[PDB]
């Protein structure tokens, strides 16, 4: 299991996930499903994600990120969770 952050809990709860603990797949599932259904991806650049002004930006500390940076995505996630 993993331990999410209390900021992220507010986003998760908006996707139905009101629990304080979830699985590794679930954390990224609720996140992915949210952006996918929100339309927060560029049509021309579906590999770029806007975190600026969303709850993801608040916790990442960056205005935008690239999905291409898998090694960065994992470090951002592991800084949110407890190993």
């Amino acid at each position: 299991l993993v331990r999410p952050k209390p900021l992220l809990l507010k986003l998760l709860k908006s996707v139905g996930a009101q629990k304080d603990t979830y699985t590794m797949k679930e954390v990224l599932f609720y996140l992915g499903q949210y952006i996918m259904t929100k339309r927060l991806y560029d049509e021309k650049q579906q590999h770029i994600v806007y975190c600026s002004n969303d709850l993801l930006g608040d916790l990442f500390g960056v205005p935008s990120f690239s999905v291409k940076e898998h090694r960065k995505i994992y470090t951002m996630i592991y800084r949110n969770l407890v190993v």
């Binding site: 699985t23 590794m24 797949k25 990224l28 599932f29 992915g32 996918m36 991806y41 579906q46 590999h47 999905v67 291409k68 898998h70 995505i73």
Partner: protein
């Protein structure tokens, strides 16, 4: 399991899979219809089977 266009992702769905979000899976030969129907962290591929 997390299986997309690992040769050239041109879509959000494709690049989402490449992240392997979940980790490794035992690659079950169970027939699914979605990633939620498959346990652990496995995703349903375009054949309806986990990978």
């Amino acid at each position: 399991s997390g299986s997309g266009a690992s040769k050239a992702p041109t879509s959000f769905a494709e690049y989402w899979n490449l992240l392997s979000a979940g980790g490794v899976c035992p690659k079950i030969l169970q027939r699914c219809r979605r990633d939620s129907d498959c346990p652990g962290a496995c995703i349903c591929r375009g054949n309806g089977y986990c990978g």
